[PDB]
Design a protein around this ligand. Structure first.
Ligand SMILES: CCN(CC)Cc1cccc(CCc2nc3ccc(F)cc3c(=O)n2-c2ccccc2Cl)n1
Lengths: 336, 35, 100, 44, 50
């Protein structure tokens, strides 16, 4: 970025969109960064707009192309274009089923103490068949061991047959249990089933559009999620978006984060590829290109956005910076 | 998620009926050697 | 290809699991919640479109209705109404697919 | 003829370790067969 | 089913219904609880008439 200058300084989705917008209208543009940020909000006391939306109402810019939320408070002050990218609130969890094969699990149901206890009974019966009747008696006692089990030797094989019968049955019985219990798994569950259990915690951002959604939501499923996170201790909220991403990675799959599908799908495609979007979106929303009201650019820009969606351009630009240039390109097609 | 696992305290119930049969097996072995 | 949307649904029901159909998610999600509950939406959506409320140009009703729709979405009305006619009114319940 | 009925000193440890190996499979065969008869999953 | 009202609302194999005209029916109507409102929506649109 130091050697270059001008519009080529920056690269991204909206950057490519900035040209495709200018091509179907015909204007020499200039990519300016907002001096403060925060998208577009209005203060409570002073009631002065700030951010990108503010630089349209005050005439400091001529158009705002960015992932700008199409909200009602912003529609009152600027003309939005139709959505170039539909999205919604989603869920993010760790990559499940990370373990575990190997010969150490080959002695799991029968506990570690029983595999070393069954061997005390085998040599204890091969030494009694030594008495009731060194190289051919151990071969005869082993020849009776593989086929289940004098009046003194018959009750040895009779009682040993009961004992070996119990272990193989308690082995087979418990082995089905670990497979029936495995056969439940979520795995991978819906947004409603996330609210039902409290073993894996979940939360959102501390101040943003995501938290306020659960606040005044009158839907039972989402109100139950709200009453949980409000009283949740320790605090399930996070300060910044970077923290919420990091907290899921270091919780051993025991914490989830809720955010917009766009920002969720993008972290799925960046190293170390341990996040994943699960379930469908929660609400309906999308991004839009803002213009000053009454501006001549308005309706032409809105018409152009519809042109790019139906020609297959906005779908292609979405795939480009998400999946193609994504560092986890192999972790998407074969992840299921 | 169980993880019910297997209890050694209940496996011993058959380890005691087996050694009990091994102790009975030594009592019947001696009466065969006498008669 | 089929003649109407009606023939497209019935053909899946008589194909013994060897024919698929592609259509908007709204209609597909609705068919999923109507008896005899044999169809299902799988995978994400292929493109980004939507439904709107249409008004003649230059009409007084234009700007207000547009603003009004944004108020319904942010008041959780549109999401509730869709949940009411798709899943609530549906014959195959949303809980029927969650282990019953 | 020694394989159908489960499994010298050299030929006894052959029939014993084979009996232990086939015991695992027939049990793991039965134990997994019960799990797929209890919970029916639906493959998309 | 386990003896509880929420376990009756979560499945639709065994159906359920109330009286056509009484305080029983009107309770589910204006109730603003998560567990009871789901039972109302089901009974309101259950076909045939429960
Ligand atoms: C798959 C996640 N597992 C957690 C490590 C679940 C789990 C927990 C406890 C026990 C098990 C099954 C372990 C097992 N025990 C055996 C004992 C004797 C024997 F001859 C074979 C096995 C055996 O194959 N397993 C096993 C291990 C991993 C996958 C499947 C099986 Cl059956 N699985």
């Amino acid at each position: 970025h130091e050697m270059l200058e001008g519009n080529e300084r920056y690269e991204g989705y909206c950057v490519d969109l900035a040209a495709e917008i200018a091509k179907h209208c015909g204007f020499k543009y200039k990519l300016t960064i907002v001096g403060d940020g925060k998208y577009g909000a209005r203060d409570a006391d002073t009631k002065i707009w700030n951010g990108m939306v503010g630089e349209l109402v005050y005439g400091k810019a001529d158009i705002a192309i960015a992932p700008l939320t199409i909200t009602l408070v912003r529609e009152e002050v600027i003309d939005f274009s139709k959505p170039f990218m539909s999205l919604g609130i989603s869920i993010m969890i760790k990559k499940p089923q990370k373990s575990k094969p190997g010969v150490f699990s080959f002695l799991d149901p029968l506990a570690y103490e029983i595999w070393m206890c069954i061997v005390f009974a085998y040599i204890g019966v091969s030494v009694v068949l030594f008495l009731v009747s060194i190289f051919n008696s151990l071969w005869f006692s082993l020849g009776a061991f593989m086929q289940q089990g004098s009046l003194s030797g018959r009750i040895v094989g009779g009682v040993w047959w009961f004992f070996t019968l119990i272990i193989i049955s308690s082995y087979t019985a418990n082995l089905a249990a670990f497979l029936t219990v495995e056969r439940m798994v979520s795995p991978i569950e819906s947004a409603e089933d996330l609210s039902k259990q409290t073993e894996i915690a979940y939360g959102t951002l501390d101040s943003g559009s995501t938290k306020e959604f659960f606040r005044r939501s009158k839907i039972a499923v989402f109100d139950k999620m709200w009453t949980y996170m409000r009283s949740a201790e320790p605090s399930v909220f996070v300060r910044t978006t970077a923290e919420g991403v990091a907290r899921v990675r270091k919780s051993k799959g025991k914490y989830a984060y809720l955010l917009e599908s766009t920002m969720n799908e993008y972290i799925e495609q960046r190293k170390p590829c341990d996040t994943m979007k699960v379930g469908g979106n929660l609400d309906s929303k999308g991004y839009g290109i803002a213009t000053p009201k009454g501006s001549s650019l308005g309706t032409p820009v809105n018409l152009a956005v519809l042109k790019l969606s139906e020609q297959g351009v906005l779908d292609k630009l979405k795939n480009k910076w998400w999946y193609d240039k994504g560092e986890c390109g192999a972790k998407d097609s074969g992840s299921k | 998620e169980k993880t019910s696992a297997l209890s050694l305290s209940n496996v011993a119930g058959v380890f005691y009926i087996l050694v009990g049969g091994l102790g009975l097996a030594m009592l019947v072995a001696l009466i065969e050697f006498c008669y």
